[PDB]
Swiss-Prot record:
SMART domains: LYZ1 (SM00263). It is found in: Secreted. Substrate binds at D101. GO terms for cellular component: cytoplasm; endoplasmic reticulum; extracellular space. Lysozymes have primarily a bacteriolytic function; those in tissues and body fluids are associated with the monocyte-macrophage system and enhance the activity of immunoagents. Has bacteriolytic activity against M.luteus. It catalyses: Hydrolysis of (1->4)-beta-linkages between N-acetylmuramic acid and N-acetyl-D-glucosamine residues in a peptidoglycan and between N-acetyl-D-glucosamine residues in chitodextrins. This is Lysozyme C. The keyword RNA-binding does not apply. SUPFAM superfamilies: Lysozyme-like.
Length: 129
């Protein structure tokens, strides 16, 4: 499913991501834009052989199981495929664990490089929240 900007903001807010770990909703929408272009089916291979899945490109190296990432972990306890569903519940629950790992949203390189410090509030402009 390819979410609309405000449609994704609404979904994330409903699932409690707004202000989670102190990160405003726009930060999460921005991260999703550059990680997956709002497409829940997005998958991308990483240099180390792991793969990222879903709207927030969760890495199989530590968070989900895809059965092809040697020595990886499955800290969110779910198959990576479950992070590709039209319902973002699993991705949000897992993202909540990732952002609590210690480095906050820096866990998402794209967020650090393209969202961090910018006017992320623009990402939720015009939305009814
Ligand atoms: Cl957009
Ligand atoms: Cl915001
Ligand atoms: Cl594996
Ligand atoms: Cl959803
Ligand atoms: Cl933080
Ligand atoms: Ho990646
Ligand atoms: Ho860690
Ligand atoms: Ho409101």
């Amino acid at each position: 499913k390819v979410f609309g900007r405000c449609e994704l903001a609404a979904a994330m807010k409903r699932h409690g991501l707004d202000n989670y770990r102190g990160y405003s909703l726009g930060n999460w929408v921005c991260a999703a834009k550059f990680e997956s272009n709002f497409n829940t089916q997005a998958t991308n291979r990483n240099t180390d052989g792991s793969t990222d899945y879903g709207i927030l490109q969760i890495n199989s190296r530590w968070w989900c199981n895809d059965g092809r990432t040697p020595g990886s972990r499955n800290l969110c306890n779910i198959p990576c495929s479950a992070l590709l569903s039209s319902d973002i519940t699993a991705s949000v629950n897992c993202a909540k664990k990732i952002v609590s790992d210690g480095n906050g949203m820096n866990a998402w390189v794209a967020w650090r490089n393209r969202c961090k410090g910018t006017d992320v509030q623009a990402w939720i402009r015009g939305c009814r929240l």
